[PDB]
Amino acid sequence: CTFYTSLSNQNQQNIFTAGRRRYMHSWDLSQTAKIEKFSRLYGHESTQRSFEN
Amino acid sequence: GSIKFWDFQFATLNQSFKAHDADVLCLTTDTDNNYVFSAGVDRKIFQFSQNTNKSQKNNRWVNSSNRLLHGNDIRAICAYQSKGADFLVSGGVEKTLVINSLTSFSNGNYRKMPTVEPYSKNVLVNKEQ
Amino acid sequence: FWGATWISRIDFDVDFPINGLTITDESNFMNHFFFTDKYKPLLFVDLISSNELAIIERNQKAFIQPKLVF
Amino acid sequence: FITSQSTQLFQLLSLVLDSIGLFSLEGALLENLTLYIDKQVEIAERNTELWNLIDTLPTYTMEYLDI
Amino acid sequence: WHNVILSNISSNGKLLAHMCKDHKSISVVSLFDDSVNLSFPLGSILSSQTQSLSYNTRYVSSMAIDNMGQQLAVGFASGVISIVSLADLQIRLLKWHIDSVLSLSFSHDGSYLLSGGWEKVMSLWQLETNSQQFLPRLNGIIIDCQVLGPQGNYYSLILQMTENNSNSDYQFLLLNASDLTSKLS
Amino acid sequence: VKWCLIIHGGYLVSIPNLMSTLSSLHSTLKRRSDLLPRLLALDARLDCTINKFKTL
Amino acid sequence: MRGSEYQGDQEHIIHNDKVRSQRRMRAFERNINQFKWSEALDNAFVPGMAKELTLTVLQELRKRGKVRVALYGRDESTLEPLLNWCLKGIEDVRSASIVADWVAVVLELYGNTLESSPVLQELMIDLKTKVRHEIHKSKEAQRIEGMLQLLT
Amino acid sequence: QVEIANILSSHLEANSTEILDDLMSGSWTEPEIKKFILTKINTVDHLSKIFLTISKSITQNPWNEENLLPLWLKWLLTLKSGELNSIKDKHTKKNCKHLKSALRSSEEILPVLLGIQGRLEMLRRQAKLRED
RNA sequence: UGCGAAAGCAGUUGAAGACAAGUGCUUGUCGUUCGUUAUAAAUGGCCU
Numbered sequence: 001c002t003f004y005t006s007l008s009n010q011n012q013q014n015i016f017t018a019g020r021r022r023y024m025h026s027w028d029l030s031q032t033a034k035i036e037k038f039s040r041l042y043g044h045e046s047t048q049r050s051f052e053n
Numbered sequence: 054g055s056i057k058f059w060d061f062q063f064a065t066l067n068q069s070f071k072a073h074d075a076d077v078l079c080l081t082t083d084t085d086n087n088y089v090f091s092a093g094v095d096r097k098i099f100q101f102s103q104n105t106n107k108s109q110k111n112n113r114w115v116n117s118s119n120r121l122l123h124g125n126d127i128r129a130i131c132a133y134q135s136k137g138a139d140f141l142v143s144g145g146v147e148k149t150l151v152i153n154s155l156t157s158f159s160n161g162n163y164r165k166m167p168t169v170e171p172y173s174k175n176v177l178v179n180k181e182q
Numbered sequence: 183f184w185g186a187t188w189i190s191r192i193d194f195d196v197d198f199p200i201n202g203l204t205i206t207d208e209s210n211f212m213n214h215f216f217f218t219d220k221y222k223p224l225l226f227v228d229l230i231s232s233n234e235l236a237i238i239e240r241n242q243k244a245f246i247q248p249k250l251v252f
Numbered sequence: 253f254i255t256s257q258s259t260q261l262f263q264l265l266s267l268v269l270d271s272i273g274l275f276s277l278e279g280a281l282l283e284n285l286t287l288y289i290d291k292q293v294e295i296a297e298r299n300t301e302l303w304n305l306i307d308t309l310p311t312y313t314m315e316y317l318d319i
Numbered sequence: 320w321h322n323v324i325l326s327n328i329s330s331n332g333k334l335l336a337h338m339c340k341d342h343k344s345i346s347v348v349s350l351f352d353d354s355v356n357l358s359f360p361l362g363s364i365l366s367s368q369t370q371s372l373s374y375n376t377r378y379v380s381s382m383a384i385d386n387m388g389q390q391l392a393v394g395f396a397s398g399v400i401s402i403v404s405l406a407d408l409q410i411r412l413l414k415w416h417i418d419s420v421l422s423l424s425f426s427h428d429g430s431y432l433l434s435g436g437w438e439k440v441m442s443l444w445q446l447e448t449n450s451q452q453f454l455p456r457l458n459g460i461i462i463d464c465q466v467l468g469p470q471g472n473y474y475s476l477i478l479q480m481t482e483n484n485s486n487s488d489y490q491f492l493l494l495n496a497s498d499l500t501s502k503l504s
Numbered sequence: 505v506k507w508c509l510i511i512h513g514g515y516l517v518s519i520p521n522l523m524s525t526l527s528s529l530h531s532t533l534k535r536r537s538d539l540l541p542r543l544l545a546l547d548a549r550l551d552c553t554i555n556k557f558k559t560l
Numbered sequence: 561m562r563g564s565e566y567q568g569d570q571e572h573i574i575h576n577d578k579v580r581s582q583r584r585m586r587a588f589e590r591n592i593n594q595f596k597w598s599e600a601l602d603n604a605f606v607p608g609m610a611k612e613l614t615l616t617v618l619q620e621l622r623k624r625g626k627v628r629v630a631l632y633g634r635d636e637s638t639l640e641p642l643l644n645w646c647l648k649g650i651e652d653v654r655s656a657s658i659v660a661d662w663v664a665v666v667l668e669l670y671g672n673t674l675e676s677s678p679v680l681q682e683l684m685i686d687l688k689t690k691v692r693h694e695i696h697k698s699k700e701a702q703r704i705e706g707m708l709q710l711l712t
Numbered sequence: 713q714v715e716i717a718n719i720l721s722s723h724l725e726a727n728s729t730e731i732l733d734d735l736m737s738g739s740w741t742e743p744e745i746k747k748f749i750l751t752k753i754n755t756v757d758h759l760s761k762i763f764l765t766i767s768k769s770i771t772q773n774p775w776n777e778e779n780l781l782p783l784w785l786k787w788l789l790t791l792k793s794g795e796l797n798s799i800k801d802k803h804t805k806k807n808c809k810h811l812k813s814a815l816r817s818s819e820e821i822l823p824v825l826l827g828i829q830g831r832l833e834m835l836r837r838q839a840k841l842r843e844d
Numbered sequence: 845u846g847c848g849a850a851a852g853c854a855g856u857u858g859a860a861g862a863c864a865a866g867u868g869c870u871u872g873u874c875g876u877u878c879g880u881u882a883u884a885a886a887u888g889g890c891c892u
Binding site (some may be wrong): 509513523529532537539540542543544545546547549550551553554557 | 656659660663667671675685688691692694695698699700705707711
Binding site for chain 5 (some may be wrong): 044
């Protein structure tokens, strides 16, 4: 897992986490959490069977 | 069924195209290496083009088009160009040649030669008996 | 006269009415009337008798590429 | 009169046989009525079949050339 | 301009591409400058086999112009898409839609193309490898498609629901590009 | 079934309710009869093709 | 590897997105989903296939409007499995209506092939015998229905 | 049988109004009707004339006990269906509509008759029991 | 297309202009008009 801050828009803060799974999570930044899942590779799924690294 | 373009000096992959649905049995290119033509078991001929100047500067190929012309596998393909000639000749398990134009492959007309052209006769008939 | 896909007959005592995928051939090669295309392809054509014509004609799994039908 | 748009007349007949009941009807007349109906059923079957119908190389060949 | 059959404006809002009967000719013009000024007959783009076939193959239903003006996508009622390189009028065929394509839109960078038609499926064509990604089972056929964001965060769609013949039922769908989920319907 | 109706017909007439108690017969008989028009349509078509190749 | 057992009992926010596993789809369903009309028809007539499951794929294909589409590229070798089921399916009340439609199309679509194929003809002779038998059963059910009205 | 076939052939060429009477001759049998249609009806005009005559007759009285005209129509349809629909005459389509309307009535008749036929069977059986 | 029940009962599908192809003539077309109630077919099928 790792923090991320957009180099232009400093107000944009995000956390990316991944595991031995075919999807990756992103957490934009407190009642709830805005979590998005990246699970689409656009035709290149064969080369990528895990997002862990 | 993939066509891959490798950088020679570094021996590294530049592009990968998943074009064919089966084996790619033969490849050919035009004189200027502006076009790459591939054919195989799927009976299709794919055209990969780098003719545009922007493509040439970036060194990127584009899957321009494909055509279905053969009734069976395409084992052999070759290209020829001169000031008065522009041929893309293909043949295979169908046992017949197919002739196209390299520059106008997408839109140009094509000819399917006869399977047998009896220049040398294999049959004779005797009027008597 | 006959070819791979055509048969023709010419009478040599009558004169006719005057009225892309190949080399353009700018360079040199070196250095009464009956026409039919009904019969094709032809292996061999010749006469058996004065009125009998012999026309001999030709009579594998492939990768399936479906044609859409609605 | 029958044994001598028609469904509305026959459907009216089927109502009659229901009104008459089993006890009342007489055998000899039942024979004549049965024969007529069997003829009609055959005709109705025949017409229906018509109605549905309305809705519904050699190795060697010898030929003469046209010259 | 006279006798404008079809008209489109780039995502930037700085280029206008239009087709006229002056059969037909396509011309692209920059709005705020004189840098871009091009015109060419539709016959040059159209294929010869297309000329042999029915009128559906020669009839355009959609037209999209890239921000830089280097590419122009033409959709046809037959379901074929043709990307034209404006520099040399070179054509590239993308053929997935079985019926008329109704909406086309380039991405901001120009490396992706959103297409939609009667299939009720939104297709993202990856032009680098000619691949595609799908978002099927939308509520209706895609009248219009567009990329909405500085980084293409959102996709805006217009759906038609052609089942109801009595009235045209439009629905505006704003999807999150990250996971393609309806941010606002 | 046919003999039950013939013999016990008088008794069956004088019953307070028949539909509820004989509901199974009505459903079963109703189902078969509803197929009758379709089967005639199939039979006519089968005869048409059967006649054709038999004479040819 | 000691963290799998944890279910987030002590955490602030618990986030669940995993989609529950749907049952595996059968071969005929996958072919329909992929628009394989002809192959889906083949999966209908395979050994050890449930009668109800065979009726659905035939009803789905009709509902999709693909009855001729599934039947174009066929000959006597691959047509007999459909006719074999039709021979037994005509008897049942549930599948009688579907059999009538499918048998109608193959006749209207393979009249010529029927003439030159003796095996296909025999399938029609016995089929005509069976449909004729159903006519007797349906006609009787009308008669018992007719007299059953007399009682009430 | 040969004399009637030749007479019918002449009347078809002669456009006689006696075509109907020729078709109603009792000498006709089923195989001869097949033979006459296959061998003698080589022109579309003759095919149209016979169809028009039969269709008009059956339309007027679809319930005629005489089965012969239906047998002609049945085999005329079964054997020459390709040539019949090739005929594009508007009246021929109209005559087909009138015939279809008359025949369409009959199939509606049938479920009622089977109901009546069922009751009569139950009635006869009861009488036999009372006799015994 | 009108009416009606779902079955069906009546009634329609014309003219001009322009374009393309073939040879002034023929056919086919219309992001052209007026009037009347009035086959298809660019190998092209749905994500994770």
